Symmetry: D2
Amino acid sequence: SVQPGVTYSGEGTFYGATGVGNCLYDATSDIAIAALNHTDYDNARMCGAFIRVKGPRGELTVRIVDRCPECRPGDVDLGQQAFARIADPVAGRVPITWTLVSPDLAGPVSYRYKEGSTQWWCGIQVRNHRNPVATLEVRTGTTWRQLPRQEYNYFVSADGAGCGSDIRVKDIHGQTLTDTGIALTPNVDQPGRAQFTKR
Amino acid sequence: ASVQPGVTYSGEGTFYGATGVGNCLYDATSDIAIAALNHTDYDNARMCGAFIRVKGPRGELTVRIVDRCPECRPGDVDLGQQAFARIADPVAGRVPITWTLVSPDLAGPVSYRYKEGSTQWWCGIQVRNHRNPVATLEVRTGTTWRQLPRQEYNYFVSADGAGCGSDIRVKDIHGQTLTDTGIALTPNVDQPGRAQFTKRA
Amino acid sequence: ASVQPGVTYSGEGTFYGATGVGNCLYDATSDIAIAALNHTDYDNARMCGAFIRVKGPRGELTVRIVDRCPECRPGDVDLGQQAFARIADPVAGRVPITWTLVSPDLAGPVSYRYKEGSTQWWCGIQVRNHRNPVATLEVRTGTTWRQLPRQEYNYFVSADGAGCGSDIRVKDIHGQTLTDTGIALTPNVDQPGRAQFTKRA
Amino acid sequence: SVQPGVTYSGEGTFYGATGVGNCLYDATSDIAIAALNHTDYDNARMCGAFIRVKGPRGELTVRIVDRCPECRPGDVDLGQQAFARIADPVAGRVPITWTLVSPDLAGPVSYRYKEGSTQWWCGIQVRNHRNPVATLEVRTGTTWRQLPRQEYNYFVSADGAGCGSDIRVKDIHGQTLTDTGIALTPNVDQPGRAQFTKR
């Protein structure tokens, strides 16, 4: 699995990325985006990860927004303009190396309840996270309940437990941020009060 | 993450020739109160070592999960032969059951076991004697911590050796973390930690 | 193998900006009647290229499956935006639908496409223009045949190159086999076979 | 995936095999049985496969009856007495090489309906097959329906379609055997009329 501090080798390709994809983020005007190969995508664990990709002609930090099912471990399918920053587009497929980075990013994490969320059933997506998210939990009285991440990058409470309650997220470095006062309001990005530490 | 505390599940109970060995990679035991859990609820070993109180037509018994039943449906439990006779007529073969996760009295702290062949270059760690089911295990890497993915065979594995032999911390399904140090990198020896998870009412 | 001929399914229809590219690895198309199928029913690309007749409040439309929708539930279809408007009011966004597999009129035989980079050491073959969903693909190895496993990206792959460039035979979900020869080991070119699967009433 | 005509390398271990296991076969007095590592087991595709295993002290053909989740690709967890034919039990873990074989085996294939099979739901297991089975289908009028194999080595018709009808099985070599007159009778092994070719 993808780990910080490790340089991976693979192949870079490109596609018509818009920001929509398997991570269920919104379309973006930012070109520095990519789909990650299925293996490394890891059931959305790498959604929103920033990776710095080196190609024959340059390097660029991109955000993972999508999954590439036919790409092999180590492979990255960059957006068309992102690819042109690191390689000649005529080459089509080029050697790359890349690493997971913890970049500058302003503001706190935010939370988005999935369409149709209520106290009976809900899903939560984390947005604006500096480092990849490992887990999400919701408070159930005196204890907390982990919500399983789905490949489409929402953490789901299938029976509604904890929906509308306190939320806490833990990144891949082991840091936990706890958030109160997130309303049970589908389709709105709600800021928390903290960001993960820049590593 | 189907199985949740505070929920009563319905299903069918069957039995098999359980010895204590199985998909959770625990040891043979003389204890009767053991069972295999259906694949769905087993949940990639998240329910390994869980204690569930099972009610059948002839009684109730708290059993620990030591194995996985691939053909059993959600809600189903394949009990050890002697455990089944405590809650049902063995001649029946298959009976209606209800069950729930429990947080029982348990003596001693959690323990850790390094997998055969573990070194600083590759390792796996199994948790033993945990009062509540374990959700996650991490090892310390300098100033940060690294999650080790649990395999279906109930070891949390560090494929590149990072954190092997370092501090360990485990988080149960209720959200409580226990941190342990001084666990030596010694394969196939159970080593006690400092504490047990809280008993949940 | 959830989706079966002769069965009608209920679910929810939504829409997305479909261009024809997607998880089935087909080419961009100007055709209206395309859709993504929910992950469960997509079934590891078994439903790639399936034709389903979808009914919504405004009427019915036969669409071909070109993509997979991971967040959609069993029974759900994520139609192309223009296709959706044939069966429902786009302002509604999400509508009840019913649908079933169809065996439509289709011109010409099946065709085969070797994946980029296919050689004697590794190859993948995609089937195109098939009237009914494909179940299996095999390549001839001397006196026997070898199944190539379908990947979720809708190529049947020979991981070690065995049978690459050999005779090919495909079996549809109705159990009919078509055997084809003379398909060259030439990546990125659609090569026609000699026959189409039977039209099923 | 496991193919004929290839020599695989791995490690041999042993366990208390009785014949019961992930393939849902019955207990047997034959000691020449083994569990195959999860990857090569391949969702029961290798259930009932015969593999010839060479260890440091001997060679033995065993039948796959079970799955070993912690074993790596190429690894075989033999029954205790089978292991003792190819290695000293005190060694515990030994290098092995093995191949998929098409051995002598008498009688035709047989079929077993799973407990609880009816016109509304059924499962079918194939027994006494010389070569591994790839697919099983049941006849639905003028067409045939593939039944998906489960990891527990029954092919299941979730809605009962084809249950009690004609059955046909195709082995990994591409040979199809068709059988009529198999009754919808749970828990009995019913012989077909043919065996797969000895390759």
